[PDB]
């Protein structure tokens, strides 16, 4: 009670609590994004582009989860890459509940290619199944998804050479970059079961340095504004 | 995937050579251990507040 040791213990507890509160306030000022996608789906390219101008604002190599810390327009972003996590997603996907948005990356040029596990499995079909699984989890019901369609030029060359009917037999239209890209985009967007709660922002990755991060910033600001409107009761 | 089959069958044949006892004896041993230390379990029998560290000093 009044002993010196008890006073010292209470003082240390109060100091630690103040430090914890300060760290929590500092961490609450950060926007968290989850990066997903197939293996060779252009994930690293998007990470490099986002960190080209802004990076980080005897440790052992982790390779489990990779954090990218970049700031744009006075807004702090954190991206978590779980590509190297080879295990069941069901056991740790709930750790990312509460992220502002999910950055899903899929390559347009792998529709012709097939997985190495078996020949009769399209890579784009694997990406679609992953998108369906991650867009309808019980944890990400309120979380918006930012969809990036990488490798537009390779896809254009491939559809110039090879037709799109192999990946989508039901498809019936002219083989052109615009129409095929629109078809792929709408096919990915039709997997969103929670139409009323979440929204999908689709962008085609471009060689310009700042356009992709600008699109991400616009999507995050739109998500924040719509969440505020919902809290206020006007949305 | 045939090399792992040999390891699996070796593990199975190794797991089947252990001595086993009757379930009645094991249940009796568990019950005896439970009843022997029942007096020393503060959770089973609520402790008086005089010597309860988490309520009163």
């Amino acid at each position: 009670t009044l002993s010196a040791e008890d006073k010292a213990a209470v003082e240390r507890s109060k100091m630690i609590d103040r430090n914890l509160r300060e760290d929590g306030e500092k961490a609450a000022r950060e926007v968290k994004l989850l990066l997903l996608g197939a293996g060779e789906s252009g994930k690293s390219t998007i990470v490099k582009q986002m960190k080209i101008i802004h990076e980080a604002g005897t440790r052992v190599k982790t390779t489990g989860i990779v954090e990218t810390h970049f700031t744009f327009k006075d807004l702090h972003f954190k991206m978590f890459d779980v590509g190297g996590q080879r295990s069941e997603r069901k056991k740790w996907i709930h750790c990312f509940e509460g992220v502002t948005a999910i950055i899903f990356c899929v390559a347009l040029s792998d529709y012709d290619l097939v997985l190495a596990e078996d020949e009769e499995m399209n890579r784009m079909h694997e990406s679609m199944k992953l998108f369906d699984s991650i867009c309808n989890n019980k944890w990400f019901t309120d979380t918006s998804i930012i969809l990036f369609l990488n490798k537009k030029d390779l896809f254009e060359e491939k559809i110039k050479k090879s037709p799109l009917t192999i990946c989508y037999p039901e498809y019936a239209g002219s083989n052109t970059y615009e129409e095929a890209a629109a078809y792929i985009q709408c096919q990915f967007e039709d997997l969103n079961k929670r139409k009323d709660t979440k929204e999908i922002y689709t962008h085609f990755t471009c060689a310009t340095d700042t356009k992709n991060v600008q699109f991400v910033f616009d999507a995050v600001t739109d998500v924040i504004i719509k969440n505020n409107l919902k809290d206020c009761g006007l949305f | 995937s045939i090399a792992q089959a040999r390891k699996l069958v070796e593990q199975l044949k190794m797991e089947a050579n252990i001595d086993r006892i009757k379930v009645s004896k094991a249940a009796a041993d568990l019950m005896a251990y439970c009843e022997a230390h029942a007096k020393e379990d503060p959770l089973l029998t609520p402790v008086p507040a005089s010597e309860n560290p988490f309520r009163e000093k």
Partner: protein, 286 residues
């Protein structure tokens, strides 16, 4: 016949106190409801509780007895508490509107520089405006007509004080709230507006539903504020200037006087008893 009036007033104070106290308790005992918006809503609930505990009983006694039987000093205390607490309730409404406007129109400020110190500053400014409106009639600047009739507790009817108090307590807040909520409405509409045919039809229907909801909610807020407080301030701005030829009917005058206090009862319903988080917290407490 006075028994009916007494029981109606008593149940009015009882409901107001119960609602405001429930809102304050729910905010206090829940960790989930501890953000800036709920802090402002809780301060508004506390102000309404002060109106219902410190002002409504004396006003109800005045209504029932149809005369003031408590004293001149008690009359001054009642007037000061009445002007201070009710002006505060209005400026809490304006502060909530301002916070919503800042959150909706400035996401960067919402993420970075939005801290509970902002809520504390807004509450302090509201109470400071309340004091600036309530104090000066006490420190002079009051006509002797207030003390001329001992069997009455009317607010000072000086033209300058009437203009000052009415403007700074209802009319400046009204314009501020109208401008802020108009900007908020424009922002909401801009956000909403911005087989393939089935998806397009579904999106159009969803946009129409959201537009109807963002019209209804804004209408509820603004209409409640207007229909609660506007008639009394129109009366208080018109009658003092026109001393004669503007007799006020007793029943209509009493209804106009007592309409303003219903805002302190309807405020928790609109700002607290509607959002989902408060309902979940109340269900958990129940």
């Amino acid at each position: 016949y006075q028994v009916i009036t007494s029981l109606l007033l008593g149940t009015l104070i009882f409901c107001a106190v119960l609602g405001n106290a429930c809102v304050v308790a729910a905010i206090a005992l829940e960790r989930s409801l501890q953000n800036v918006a709920n802090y402002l809503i809780g301060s508004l609930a506390v102000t309404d509780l002060m109106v219902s505990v410190l002002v409504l009983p004396m006003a109800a006694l005045y209504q029932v007895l149809n005369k003031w039987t408590l004293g001149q000093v008690t009359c001054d205390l009642f007037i000061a508490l009445d002007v201070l607490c009710c002006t505060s309730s209005i400026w809490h409404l304006c502060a909530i509107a301002l916070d919503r406007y800042w959150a909706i129109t400035d996401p960067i400020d919402y993420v970075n520089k939005r801290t509970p110190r902002r809520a504390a500053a807004l509450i302090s400014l509201t109470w400071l405006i309340g004091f600036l409106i309530s104090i000066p009639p006490m420190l002079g600047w009051r006509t002797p007509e207030d003390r001329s009739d001992p069997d009455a507790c009317t607010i000072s009817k000086d033209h300058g004080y009437t203009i000052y108090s009415t403007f700074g307590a209802f009319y400046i807040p009204l314009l501020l709230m109208l401008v802020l909520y108009g900007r908020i409405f424009r922002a909401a509409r801009f956000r909403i507006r911005k087989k393939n045919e089935r998806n397009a039809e579904a999106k159009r229907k969803m946009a129409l539903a959201r537009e109807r909801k963002t019209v209804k909610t804004l209408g509820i807020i603004m209409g409640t504020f207007i229909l609660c407080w506007l008639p009394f301030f129109i009366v208080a701005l018109v009658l003092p200037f026109c001393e004669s030829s503007c007799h006020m009917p007793t029943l209509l005058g009493a209804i106009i006087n007592w309409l303003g206090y219903s805002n302190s009862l309807l405020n928790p319903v609109i700002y607290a008893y509607f959002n989902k988080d408060f309902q979940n917290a109340f269900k958990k407490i129940i």
